[PDB]
Every structure is written in structure tokens, then in C-alpha cells.
Design an enzyme around this catalytic site. Sequence first.
Site, short mmCIF file in Angstrom:
data_model
loop_
_atom_site.label_atom_id
_atom_site.label_comp_id
_atom_site.label_asym_id
_atom_site.label_seq_id
_atom_site.Cartn_x
_atom_site.Cartn_y
_atom_site.Cartn_z
N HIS B 362 81.03 7.19 98.12
CA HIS B 362 79.60 6.96 98.28
C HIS B 362 79.02 5.94 97.30
O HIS B 362 77.80 5.73 97.26
CB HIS B 362 78.84 8.27 98.07
CG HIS B 362 79.21 9.38 99.02
ND1 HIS B 362 78.48 9.66 100.13
CD2 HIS B 362 80.24 10.28 98.99
CE1 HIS B 362 79.05 10.68 100.77
NE2 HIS B 362 80.11 11.08 100.07
N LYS B 555 62.24 10.05 96.95
CA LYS B 555 63.61 10.08 96.56
C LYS B 555 63.71 10.25 95.06
O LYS B 555 62.71 10.23 94.35
CB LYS B 555 64.29 8.81 96.93
CG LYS B 555 63.58 7.61 96.37
CD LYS B 555 64.00 6.40 97.15
CE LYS B 555 63.45 6.31 98.56
NZ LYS B 555 64.50 5.78 99.48
N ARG B 556 64.94 10.40 94.61
CA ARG B 556 65.20 10.58 93.19
C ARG B 556 64.46 9.52 92.38
O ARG B 556 64.45 8.33 92.75
CB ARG B 556 66.71 10.50 92.92
CG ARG B 556 67.12 10.65 91.49
CD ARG B 556 68.62 10.98 91.39
NE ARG B 556 69.41 10.07 92.24
CZ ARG B 556 70.06 8.98 91.82
NH1 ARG B 556 70.09 8.64 90.53
NH2 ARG B 556 70.72 8.22 92.71
N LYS B 561 65.50 2.66 91.91
CA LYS B 561 64.77 3.01 93.14
C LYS B 561 63.38 2.38 93.21
O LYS B 561 62.75 2.31 94.28
CB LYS B 561 64.60 4.52 93.24
CG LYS B 561 65.86 5.36 93.26
CD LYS B 561 66.51 5.38 94.59
CE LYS B 561 67.60 6.46 94.65
NZ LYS B 561 68.45 6.24 95.83
N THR B 666 69.96 8.08 104.04
CA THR B 666 69.77 8.93 105.20
C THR B 666 68.29 9.24 105.37
O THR B 666 67.85 9.43 106.48
CB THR B 666 70.61 10.20 105.14
OG1 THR B 666 70.38 10.81 103.86
CG2 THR B 666 72.10 9.85 105.37
N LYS B 670 65.76 9.25 108.83
CA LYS B 670 64.87 10.31 109.26
C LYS B 670 63.47 9.76 109.54
O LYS B 670 62.84 10.11 110.55
CB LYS B 670 64.76 11.42 108.18
CG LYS B 670 66.07 12.10 107.82
CD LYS B 670 65.94 12.97 106.58
CE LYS B 670 67.31 13.39 106.07
NZ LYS B 670 67.11 14.10 104.76
C1 LIG Z 1 67.52 13.30 103.64
C2 LIG Z 1 67.22 13.85 102.31
C3 LIG Z 1 67.73 13.16 101.21
C4 LIG Z 1 68.53 11.90 101.46
O1 LIG Z 1 68.59 11.27 100.35
P1 LIG Z 1 68.33 9.61 100.15
O2 LIG Z 1 67.28 9.65 99.08
O3 LIG Z 1 67.81 8.81 101.38
O4 LIG Z 1 69.62 9.12 99.63
C5 LIG Z 1 67.48 13.63 99.91
N1 LIG Z 1 66.73 14.75 99.76
C6 LIG Z 1 66.22 15.40 100.81
C7 LIG Z 1 65.39 16.64 100.53
C8 LIG Z 1 66.47 15.00 102.11
O5 LIG Z 1 65.97 15.71 103.13
#
Ligand SMILES: *Cc1c(COP(=O)(O)O)cnc(C)c1O
Lengths: 825, 824
Positions: B362, B555-556, B561, B666, B670
Site C-alpha cells: 500500500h 481523513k487522517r 494531506k 477509497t 465513496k
Molecule cells: C473509507 C474510509 C477511509 C478511507 O480512507 P482514505 O482516507 O480515503 O485513505 C478512512 N476512514 C473511514 C472512516 C472510511 O470510511
Amino acid sequence: KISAKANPEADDATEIAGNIVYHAKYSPHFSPLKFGPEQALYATAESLRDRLIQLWNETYVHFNKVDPKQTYYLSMEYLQGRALTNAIGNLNLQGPYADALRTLGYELEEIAEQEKDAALGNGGLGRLASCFLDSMATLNLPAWGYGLRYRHGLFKQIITKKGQEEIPEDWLEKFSPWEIVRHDVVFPVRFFGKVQVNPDGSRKWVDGDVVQALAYDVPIPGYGTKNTISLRLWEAKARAEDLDLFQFNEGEYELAAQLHSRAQQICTVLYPGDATENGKLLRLKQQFFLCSASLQDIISRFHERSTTSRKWSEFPSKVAVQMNDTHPTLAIPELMRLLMDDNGLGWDEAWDVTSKTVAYTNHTVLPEALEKWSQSLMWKLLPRHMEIIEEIDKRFVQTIRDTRVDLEDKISSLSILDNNPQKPVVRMANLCVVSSHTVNGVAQLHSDILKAELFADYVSIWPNKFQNKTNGITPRRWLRFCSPELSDIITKWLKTDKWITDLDLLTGLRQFADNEELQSEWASAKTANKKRLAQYIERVTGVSIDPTSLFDIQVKRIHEYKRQLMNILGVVYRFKKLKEMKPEERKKTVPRTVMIGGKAFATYTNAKRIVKLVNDVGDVVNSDPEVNEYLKVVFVPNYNVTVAEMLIPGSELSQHISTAGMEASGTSNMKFALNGCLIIGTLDGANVEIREEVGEENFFLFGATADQVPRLRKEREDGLFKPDPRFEEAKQFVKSGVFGSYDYGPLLDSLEGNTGFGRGDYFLVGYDFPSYMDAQAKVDEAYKDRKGWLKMSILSTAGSGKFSSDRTIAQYAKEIWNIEACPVP
Amino acid sequence: KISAKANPEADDATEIAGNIVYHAKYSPHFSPLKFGPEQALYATAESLRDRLIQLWNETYVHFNKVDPKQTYYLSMEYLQGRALTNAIGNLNLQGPYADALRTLGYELEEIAEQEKDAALGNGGLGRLASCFLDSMATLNLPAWGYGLRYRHGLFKQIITKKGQEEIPEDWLEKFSPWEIVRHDVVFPVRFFGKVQVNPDGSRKWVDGDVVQALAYDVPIPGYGTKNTISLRLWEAKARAEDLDLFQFNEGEYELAAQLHSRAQQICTVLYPGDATENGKLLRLKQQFFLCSASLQDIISRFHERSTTRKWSEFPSKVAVQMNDTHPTLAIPELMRLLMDDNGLGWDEAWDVTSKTVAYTNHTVLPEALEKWSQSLMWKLLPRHMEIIEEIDKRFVQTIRDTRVDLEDKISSLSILDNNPQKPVVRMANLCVVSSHTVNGVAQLHSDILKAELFADYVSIWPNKFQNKTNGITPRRWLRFCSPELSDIITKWLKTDKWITDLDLLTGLRQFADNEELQSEWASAKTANKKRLAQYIERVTGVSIDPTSLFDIQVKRIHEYKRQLMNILGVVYRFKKLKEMKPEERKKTVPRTVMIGGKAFATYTNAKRIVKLVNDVGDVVNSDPEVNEYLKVVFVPNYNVTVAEMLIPGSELSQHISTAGMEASGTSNMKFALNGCLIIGTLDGANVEIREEVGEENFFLFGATADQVPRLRKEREDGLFKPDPRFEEAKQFVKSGVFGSYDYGPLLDSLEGNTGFGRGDYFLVGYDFPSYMDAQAKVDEAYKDRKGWLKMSILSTAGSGKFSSDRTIAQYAKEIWNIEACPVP
Ligand SMILES: *Cc1c(COP(=O)(O)O)cnc(C)c1O
Ligand SMILES: *Cc1c(COP(=O)(O)O)cnc(C)c1O
């Protein structure tokens, strides 16, 4: 072939079997393929739990509506044992459950043996609490027990080449199918900290550590009633938020989880070792935790039953709190704290409530046994409670100065606080007596001694405070359920089964004690029980015992005052005699299997040495083909309620041979008598009453009496003791090396010298040995006369009615608690 | 009013309600009087669990009888989320459960909100595993996941005035109604100790500590199938007998319970901090524990399916997938179990192992690939180090025998790095050497693995490397989180078959200009926005305007980022609004900016960024001059549930990482699936999303990956010309307008020309102008409602490729060689 079909009300074999299969599938705790006896146990227990939940719920609703005065029993121990047979029995579903399990391919006994005892207690104090709960349920009384949910009991005893070894119990390591968690019933319990003083003079305990007390209910069904009460157990927990993530992520794992650790410690074991400050504090934490969580719950329930908030004056009219020994003494200042601080009551109002709510049961003869705690340790752990205890004492002393100036010179001994310059302590028994409206002992002679000697000045102050409540045992677990075949004989001959809740009906057997048909049925029942016991002993010890031999049992805590040492020295003597006899003479003797069991406190050196001695003697005796057709000796490991349920029904003679004057009671003695087991014993504890009830002629008495013991100890000190040569011969035979390489000299030194701590035979093993051995000879002669022996055995059961815990609890209810039946319709 | 009546097969409203009441009474976990929403949740979950147990059991029996090749997915994370809606949905019992709860006095939403997320993961790696499980079930594949039963997750994020605070998760503090304990499924796992040499020459790992691995199953139901697989989770336990009573009774409580303590540490949290030796060891224990317990279970199951078995059948009956390098120890552990416990010779064991195991990578940055001290590995896992040394010895010999041209690269290709300062084990090298297949997670990522990171390995094994583009399940991420939009899709496509055949979404394209579809699409988005606004007010206290553009970045929190870029752009927009005359403000596009994500607790600038967002919001949101045009909210405790609320109501989402730093994305998928447009860099999954939805339906900006090194060098050489809008935004933050907190230290990261933690390594300044210009394009696009709605429809219409059903079908065919095994 039997398909899953839920039916929580299942009461016939077909419905029950379906419900068991339903739980096996839909309450799984294992892979689904195999349905072994373990899985069958859990699924069967769950089916019974469905019935118990219905009844527990109905009882809770009924008591809520009726709002009766309710008793709460506080105990640091409950010896609950296995629940399965008792649940089935109290629900009167024996036939249907046996048939159900058979259709699933199991005998109920196979499944019952998979159940671990609930390791919630250690000894008679705990088993008393457990019998009381059964009697509370059966008598339809509004009464609960509170306790701690100990994870590892005291210890599981194993026997190795070294003797006793102690390992943690594992009864919760999978799960307990009986209990019901109540995640909404959580109360905070504090430790350490300090007292905040507000401008208005109110005071509040703050800071320190706070743990969460989480409730688990164990339903206790009654016999022939819907009434199903609770043993509510507390688990000490920290909150998820109490874990410090910063420390954990720094690799400081112990620091991070220190509150979780301190919480887990509370419920790890019973009676954690307290030679160190850490251990003393942990013992006090356990006691406080039980008291604080329970009282918070009790107060909450008092309010929830209000129909309008209710007057505090109603509290002692609606609540009774019984302290089993001094372990729950902190309930006194804790109830004061909760009333004054959390609920704003003034001192006098709070004291009136507290003093009328709490009663104290004492269990002991020796003042040295009564709990005392360092004043410094109490201040550190429970500062607000020490403030309250100081004020209780201040006011008590003022009562003496205002109303009983004649007792001024005894203030130093009567006060709760002992201000000794070296070791100031809180005298917990004094706090209990001063605060409680009633104090009771547990046998007439015990209670008389409490009044006449130990607490005489308190009796002068409060002439009606002290009572007696003679202990008892439940005839459900201890006769109907542990000895069903004998029970069916009793029912046949009395032409009623009403003796199961009216145990004095057993006296109706007396008229038949010479009836040869009854004697034949009685003998057959004992024989079947002996065969079952022999099977059990072989499985757990590896020793095959001869069921035609006299089964002679001594099972209780291993202690010098209990005199297992006297028993084993007598066995050693009997062995030596057998070895010295010609075979023709051996054939004249009464073959006997001697079984000894019980646990030794791990740091109690001589008790552990005694366990080792019994095993070493057995190893030699049992493997000697010259005598082992006449004598075997077995140490029965891991004595607990289950072991008792196997031993008692198959017992013929039991030994209750403590130094006279040292036992207040003796509930196991009662269990043996109830099951037709004759007793060899001293005039001591429950033996006094058992002998009165069954008749002197049906009991084997020996030994010095209580009033002689001081003279006899003085005679020993003065060089006037004349030991019997058989006693010296027994001791020397142990010292000869015949039992292997272990040096028993150190143990036997306890019997040598004329004075000095740990010496001079304080417990009169030597002195009583000759009358003990003469009483054993009388036993042998009596056992040869089968008709005579069976008559004695029948008369023992026939005279056992007084020992019902139903009698005991009815007396507490009327004379102490002022509660009455509240039958659930 | 409704009577308890058990019916584990309940499938209509009346039967279901009876069964719920039955569990409330006879599976109690609370006092019996009150049946509040919490109690209703547990009783409803238990009712659904009855259905899941029946199916899990049937699936287990069927797979046992068929003895198919079975895949086992090993992952250190699973982001399972809440299970209730998904269970109801996959069983197709929405109506009956809704009706049942209504008869008991509850709306299903009130009950669904009582459920805590299963805190078994942290990020995308874990959510990928979770989507994969759903797809494995739905595709009828014989496939399980294994994981650790973490008690406290990573952390629950609390926002105080000080910013982020971290507290343990509490999802198991009462109980989880989904899981099924298996007390018979217990395997021993060893740590430390030593290697015994037997008289015959065989070897055995002995001594050290032994913990018990206890299994819990989490049933995973498939959509439109009986097939119900497992996520089997391991709890590390000591035995009662491991407590030392002597020590406990001496008052030495920590010593007495030390084995219990070491066991509990394994499942306390995800990714325990590892700056210390203790923490490094605990991370390795966790990885080993997962691997050893799972492999012992897998081998046990292989044998139990025997009808009469030969070890030669093992790689024909078992696939083990390593999700990242965390499960690398599966390689030497399988070797150990085969050779030591089962007596196989090295060559036989290796053939089995190498054909069983495959590795999914990854990572973009080589510096991210796990390496462990050789000394630590010897201390914790001595037998595994013996095995790894032999793997490496044999591999290096293969190079010397067959590829003499690579002799000079042995030092970089070997698994062992014998660097004299810090000798380490290169776990990625061990994975690539040992695995029959290695895959990346996006076409460009996979191409980079082959061309650059592992070029020499590709030369050695020309068919080992593959691509498997990541995906997301359209059950949780469309059908269940956005039911009203789903019903529109079904209506317009004239079928609901898209739920398992997501490429059918392309049938929407023909309607993207349709005024009626655009109207329904807008209404659905509006309803989702209103629900999101309700949620945001509940969790932050801020009222947001559902007529404003909803702009989300979740996101994180990390410098790469570029949440910092976003918030600086917000600061600039705020300043412009304040400076405008009201007539000019009325010409702007009102926007609500939502930012969420967790910061690693020791990551100082990430925590400062969370603090900044909240401080900016405190000022912006309470300024009556501009708050009708702009609000900014920090959404706390981002997790699967938060995503389920935000995604359906989103209009614009930001995927703005420095180009070249993302392998995939991902969440991007979504958002696109739910008709949310993306402003983003040409990076990660944005590349594929843009291809599929069309460049005209995506807002691209910023440097490309190939430019980043030049741009960093230009900065180093003093040639960077910052845009005045960027300087103006920074200075405004430094002015004290957002309160007493000094953001100087944070913004120093953007200053200077070189040096670690300085010189704007992530190109915030450089990309700022094109980013702001792209945001202006977003505003203009958002004013043209017909154009916007067309883009939104085209985004969903082009999202079919991103189904995890496509991903898992590809792994099954090209890597695992497993096939459907439908339960009758
Ligand atoms: C889909 C999803 C992610 C996916 O992480 P990316 O930040 O796009 O790498 C992370 N956390 C949650 C809660 C998700 O539903
Ligand atoms: C009855 C019983 C006791 C009673 O204790 P004693 O004081 O020894 O008579 C203790 N342990 C067990 C298991 C019992 O059943």
C-alpha cells in the site's frame, strides 16, 4: 434428532429438550459441531435460567409494589457451590430434566459434573450465608444477599509430592451461565482522597481513586414457591477513560493501567494476604467496596418504591442490614456518610436511621480474632469514615459520662478507638456492638458467653441488644438434593414430603428405628452412596477404597485446634498395630477407610505440614498389602461444596474433634447428622446441640470439656502431665522414618515442652488421645452390630429437625429484622 | 403490550417484534423495568444475530463438506463500523424491522444511533479489509478475515477548547451483541524463549511466555445470499493458573499478574506507540500473535476437512493474503509450524509456504516499509530469526547461481540489512521474496512498485507483480447509507441489479441532462444535507445552512494531506468576505466547510492543525457580518459512522494531498459514488476517478508527482515566488484574529528553504494559487445548477469500476484461485 425450539416456560421433557437445543444453537459459546457434556451443561443451565429470570422478575415487581420491609445480608463470603441440581430441584423439575437430557444422549450426573463451583467463599461463614439465602427464598421473605464477585476464590487445592499447592480458581475463565449482568446498576466507590469542608459546614469526600461497582444478580429460587430472590454480586471496574493513553503509548504499561489494576485487585481473591501494608489496605478496600456499593443500591431501591421523595424516617422501617461477622462493619459509617453528606441529614437523624437499620452477627469465642485496624491506615484510605467513627466514639463516651458514670474506669476498653501509644487501632467489633440495635451469636452457649464475658459491659448498657440465633443448614441442598434416594425413603415412611420445608417432621422416623425393613432400606441407600463416593475418590485420588469398610471422614479447615493431627496420629497407631498383628488377629478388626480433607492457609506452616503428613501416611498404608485390606487413608483434595455433596451422603462416621471450647458452631456437623452419619466428637460447638437432639446414646463423646482446658494446660505447665504410652508410640513411629524422608520433627515439636509459644501442646492432642482412641474402639464395636448401628443412624436423621436454616431465618426475621412473608402470587 | 415470543427465523414485523421482546427479557444485560433505546438496540441486534448464526452455521457446514480452496485475509485493522443497518439490509428485512420497532415504540434511526462502532481499525487499510469481507460474502467466496480483537481502538477523539484530546474507545465496556465467542478455539502463542535442538537434529521453540489466543467470530452476511463468512478475531489471554498467588498474597500485585498484564497489552490499542524498545516489542508481539493464532486455526481447519491428508494439498486448499507488511511473520511462522510441529523438510515446507502466501503493498515511500532490529527479532522470536536467516541464505545463493548480474545489489536485495550501525530485517523484502504474488492497489502505484521500488525483484520474477485496484462496497456506501438516492437509481435504471453489478450505473449517463432526474437528484441531496445539518448541530452545536455548498475534507490529519492548505484557503475567503461591501458578499457562493480526521497524538503539527480549524471556526461562525456566507466546522471523532453521515450530504469533497504521496483513496470513491464532486490533485485514486467520471466533472489542480522534486529543489535554491494571497492568508493567521493561540510555530513549517520540518516540503504555498483558482471554478460551477447536477449524476454514473466486488473477483481469479461456493 431433537430440533431447536425456544420455550422459556418449558416444564415437560419434550419442551425442555427443545429449549436446551435452542440455547445450544442460539446462545453459543463454542463451535457449533460438537455438543459434548460441557456444551450440554451450559445449554441446560441457560434453559433453567429462563425459568429463573421469569420468577426473579415477578418477585422484583411484587416486592416493588408491596414495598415491604426488606433485609439485606452483607457477607464477604458465599459458598454457593454448583447451582444446577438445586435449580432443577427447587423448580421440582427433576424428572422432566432427567428425561430431557436422556433424549439428548446424556445422564444428568454427567452434565452436573461439568459445572464449576462458584468460588465466592471459603468456609462455614460463607456456606451459612448461602443456606440463609435458600431459606429466605423458601420462606417467601423479602430478603437479598450482597457479596463480591471474586474471580479466583481462595485457591484451588492441589496435592503434589510437596503437599498442598495453591492455584487460582478458574470458574469465570469461560463464563457463568447463572449470573445476570445489570449494566445500568453501577455505583461509584472512592478510596484515599480527602475531606472538603464547605462554608456552611457540610463535608464531602473528594479526590483519591474512584472505581465503578457493577452489579451481577444470581437468582436464588425457593422450594415450592415462585419467590426468587437475589444474591447481588459486585465487580470492581475502572472506566475505559481511566486508561492513560499517553503513558501506554510511551511504553509505561503498568502506569497507564494502574487504576484498572487497582480495580481488578479488589475481586481477585478472598482474604488477600495482609502481612504487608498493601495487603491490609486491599482487605479494607474489599470491605468498603462491598458496603458502599450495597448501601447505595439499597438507598436507591428505597426511593424507587416511593409512590409520591419519601421521608427518611421510613428507612429503618423499610430496610434491615445484617452484618455477617465484622467484615461489613464499614456499613455503619458509610450509611452515616451517605445520609449526612450525599443526602443532607443531620447527625442525630442519620444516627437514628443507622442504629435502627444495622444488626451484627458475631461468630467467635477468641477476642484475639476480632478485627482491628491501624488508625493511620484507616485515615489514609477512608478519611471521612474515620471522622465519623471518631464522632461515634466521642458520643458513646459522653453517654457513659452522662448516664453510666460507674463505667468511667472501663472507657479505655469499651471505646471503639484504642489509643495505645505504639499501635493505635479501631476496634471493629466495638464499633459494631455500639452501633447495632441487635447483636447475636450463633449457638446458645456461644451467645451466652458473648453476654456474660466478652461484651458484659455493653450488655449492662443495653440489656436487650444481645440475642442468640442458632445456625442451621438448608435441608434442600443438604438432604433432599444431595441424597435423593434416602429422601424418598424418608417420604415413604413419614407418608409425606412436607418434611422438606418442616424438618421437625423427621421425628416421625423414631417410631420405626427398630423396624427391620426400614433398616434394610436405610442400609441400601447408604451402600449406594458409599459406592458413589468410592467411585469419586478413585477418580480424584487414584485410590480404590473398599465400600464394605467403615467410611470415617474429617473435613474442615486444617488447623492445630481442629486436631487433624490427633486423627492422623491415631491412624498411625492403628496402622502400627495392624502391622504387628498376626493375620488371624487382623481378621478380627473393623476395616476402615479414613478420609481427611480441608485447606491450609498458605503461610500456616504446621497446617501445611499436617496435609503433607496425611498424604505421606496414606502413601505407605495404602500400598502395604499386609494391612491395606483393613486400613486405607486418603487425603481428599480441594474440599468445597461439591466435595461435601459427595462425602456427606456416603459418610458413616464423621470427626468433629476440636479442642473443647474452641468452636462456636459446626454446620458441617449438622449436615452429617442429618444424613445419618454418626459423630465422634468433643463436647464443643454444634456437637452439644446435636447430642441433645439425637440422644447421647447415638453419639461418640470423648475428651476434656471446655471448663477443664485451663486446668489441664496449667497441669502441663507445672510438669504434672502423664502422657499415654500409645501417644508416645504414635509420635515416635512418625519420627522413625517409616513415612519417608520428610522430617516431621519440627511439626511434632509443637507437642513438646511444657510452656512457650508454639510449644507445650496447647491444643491438648496428647491429653485427649487416650479417650479419643477409646471412643474409636467403641465405634468399632458399635459398627459390628449392624442393627444397632442402623438404629443410631436413623435416630440421627430423626433428631436433626432443629438444625434447619428455615428455623434460623424465621427467628432472624421475627426477632431482629421485623420482616414477614411476601409471597408472590 | 407486545408479548415475548422467540422466533430465531423471524421474517415479518409481528414475528420480529416478538423475538426482540423475547431477547429483551431472556437475554437481559440490564434491570428489567426500562426498555430504553439502548436496550432496544441490544435486543434488536440479538434478534438479527439469531438469523446470522443460522446462516454462519450453514455456510461453515457447506464449506466443510465441499472442502474448497479457502482464502484467509490477514489484517491488523478492520473498520467494521456499526453492523445493524448492514445486517438488516443484507438480509433484506428493512421494512419488517422498521415496522417491528415502531410497534415497540421506536424509530429504527433512534436505535441505530445507540450502536458504538466496532473499534477494530483506524484508516483506509482497515476499511478496505472490511469492504473486502462484504464482497467476499456477496460473491459467495470461501474467504474469511482474521484480526485482533482490540478493546480500545486507536482513540476516541474529543474536541476541547485546547484542541484534540485522546481517550480510549469503550465499545466493549458493556458488550458487543454481534460477536460469538468460541471457547474451544484456543491456540497457544509463544514469545521470547529459545531454540532447543533435539537428538535427531530437529528443532523446537521452547520456554519464554505463552499466551492463549481465544477466537471470537463476527458473522459477515452477503447481499442476496445465504453465504455468511467470518471475521475471526483473537483475544490474548493468560490462564487463571498464570496468576502467582504467593506474590499476590505478599502484596506484589503487579508481579503476581504480570503474564495477565502482558496478555492484555496485546489487545489494548491499535499501533501502540513504538518510540521505545518496549513499544517496538509490543508491536511485534501483536503481529506475531495475529499470525500464529490464525495459521494454527487455518491448519486445523485444513485437517478437519479430511475425509479419510497430504501436505502437498495445502497450497491447493489455502490462500493467505497479507494486507501490508504487518502480517509478514506469517511466512516464517508457517515454515515453523510445518517443519517443527509437523515434521516437513525445508524444501517441502517452502514450496507450501511460497505457494500459500501473497502480499499486498500500500506504500509509495520506501522509508515507510517496516524494518525491525535484528537484535529485537532474535530476542522475541529466535526460531523465526533462524528461519529468516535461512530464507535469506537461500535467496542470496539463487542470485549467485542464476543472476550473477545482480551480485553487486545483494546488499540491497537481501532480507537482512547488515548495516554495522543498525542491522535490521527488511520485512517488505521478506514478503516479496517469499510470496508467489505481490500486488499494488492502483494502476500507477503498481507500475511504480514494478519500475522503481522493486525493479530488481520484478526482473527475477517477471510474473510475481500484479495490480488490484482498490474498491468500496456499494451496499454500505450507497444502498444502505443513501437509500433515497438508491431508490432513484433503481427507478431510472429500471432495475436494482446495480447493487451487485455496479457497472450498470453507466445507464444513468443517458439521463444526465434530464430535468426530471436532475430534480429528483437535487431533492435527494437536499434531504441528505438536512440530515447532515441536524447531525452537525447535535455533535458541534453549530447550525449550518443546508442551502450552502457543503465542502468536506475527512481523513487522517497530516501535513502531506494538506488540511493546512484548506484552512488557509478558508482564512483567505473569510478575510475577503470581511473586506467586501454587502453588495459584493451577496455575489459570493455561500459555503459550509467541514473538516475532520484524527491526529496521531505525538504529531505536534497535526494537533496544531486541528486546533487551528476549531479556532478559525469559533471566530468565523460567530461573525454576523459573514456567517451567512461562510461557516467552518471541525467534525469530531471521524469514523465509519461519521462517514456514513457526511458522505450522502456531501457536494464537494477535497482530496488534496501532495501529488505522488497517495497510492489510492477509497473515501474519494465513496464520495464520487454518492454524486459528490472532487477538488483534488492528480494523485492516488483521483487519477482513476477522473478517467471514469470524465475530466469535465472533476476539479483538478496542483503540481504533478513528476514535478515535485524540481519544485523542492527550486525552493532549496531560493527561486520560489510565493503568491501574495498565500502570504496574506498566513499573515492573517499570525495577526491574532483567531485568539490567543500562537500559530507561529505551526506556520514555521512553511518557512525557510531547506531543513527537516521546514521549507514547505509538502508544497502548500506552491499549490495554493492553483488550488484557490480551482475553488473559484467550483463556485462558478455551483451557481449553474443544471450543470452541477449533471456533473453529480455523471460522477455516480461513472463509479462502477470502484466496486469492491470487482476488486475481490480479480483477487479470487488471478491470485487466490478460489471460486464461488454458494450455500444451498
Ligand atoms: C473509507 C474510509 C477511509 C478511507 O480512507 P482514505 O482516507 O480515503 O485513505 C478512512 N476512514 C473511514 C472512516 C472510511 O470510511
Ligand atoms: C457446611 C460446609 C462448611 C461448614 O463449615 P464448618 O465450620 O467446617 O462446620 C464448610 N465448607 C463446606 C464446603 C461446607 O459445605
